Amino acid sequence: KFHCPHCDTVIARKSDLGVHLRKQHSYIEQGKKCRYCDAVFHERYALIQHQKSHKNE
Amino acid sequence: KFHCPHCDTVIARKSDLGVHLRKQHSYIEQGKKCRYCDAVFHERYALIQHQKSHKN
Amino acid sequence: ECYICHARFTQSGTMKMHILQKHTENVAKFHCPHCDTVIARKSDLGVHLRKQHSYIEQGKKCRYCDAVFHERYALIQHQKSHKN
DNA sequence: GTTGCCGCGT
DNA sequence: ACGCGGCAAC
DNA sequence: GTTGCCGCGTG
DNA sequence: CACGCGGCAAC
Ligand SMILES: [Zn+2]
Ligand SMILES: [Zn+2]
Ligand SMILES: [Zn+2]
Ligand SMILES: [Zn+2]
Ligand SMILES: [Zn+2]
Ligand SMILES: [Zn+2]
Ligand SMILES: [Zn+2]
Secondary structure, three states: OOEOOOOOOEOOOOHHHHHHHHHHOOEEEEEEEOOOOOOEEEEHHHHHHHHHHHHOO | OEEOOOOOOEEOOHHHHHHHHHHHOOEEEEEEEOOOOOOEEEEHHHHHHHHHHHHO | OOOOOOOOOOOHHHHHHHHHHOOHHHOOOEEOOOOOOEEOOHHHHHHHHHHHOOOOOOOEEOOOOOOEEOOHHHHHHHHHHOOO
16 A cells, blocks of 8 residues: 555555544544634544645645 | 742842742642642642653 | 745744745754754754663663663664664 | 743843 | 743643 | 654464 | 554654
């Protein structure tokens, strides 16, 4: 297992993709709001890439 | 240069010493538990200096 | 106001982080005095020194041979070598 | 990388 | 009262 | 605290 | 060899 289907990061181990998908691309029931705008997310990776894009752009 | 009546901190200005006495050496009716053991403190300075000694 | 971009910010706090992440090619980094590691923040250098180059009172043996080390960094590089 | 920290200059 | 500057634990 | 990396322990 | 744990380390 090398490439991730939901994002761009590359991983070497097979198990390390399991923890990646389960931590970054798992679906969360209760949404989390962006700390700056009014957006709300259910995926950890989508929140991180968005929330970084505010004060980093 | 002025010396705090409760610790070896030295402060230059009287106004800054007041804030130090308020924030560091004040009493807290509900105690705060140590981040690493079951110790409980009613003063911020004691908690801080204790918690830092857990690096020993 | 981020002399590099000339992009403006309301506070100086988030301006420093814009420079650290986007303009990392202009921040004076810190060379460790014991190894080839270069570190961006000075606080991270303090941790690196405390954890990697602190003299261990005791001694920790290599998991493979009978050699003892009193520093973490030297022990890790030694165990990495056992693959060559 | 985040965030709180505090004595200090403004 | 306000805001930075170096620092530190997570 | 993050996250991928890795050594190593179960099968 | 697959899988999952837990430590690692600068960010
Ligand atoms: Zn992914
Ligand atoms: Zn947002
Ligand atoms: Zn004091
Ligand atoms: Zn304690
Ligand atoms: Zn810029
Ligand atoms: Zn070093
Ligand atoms: Zn050895």
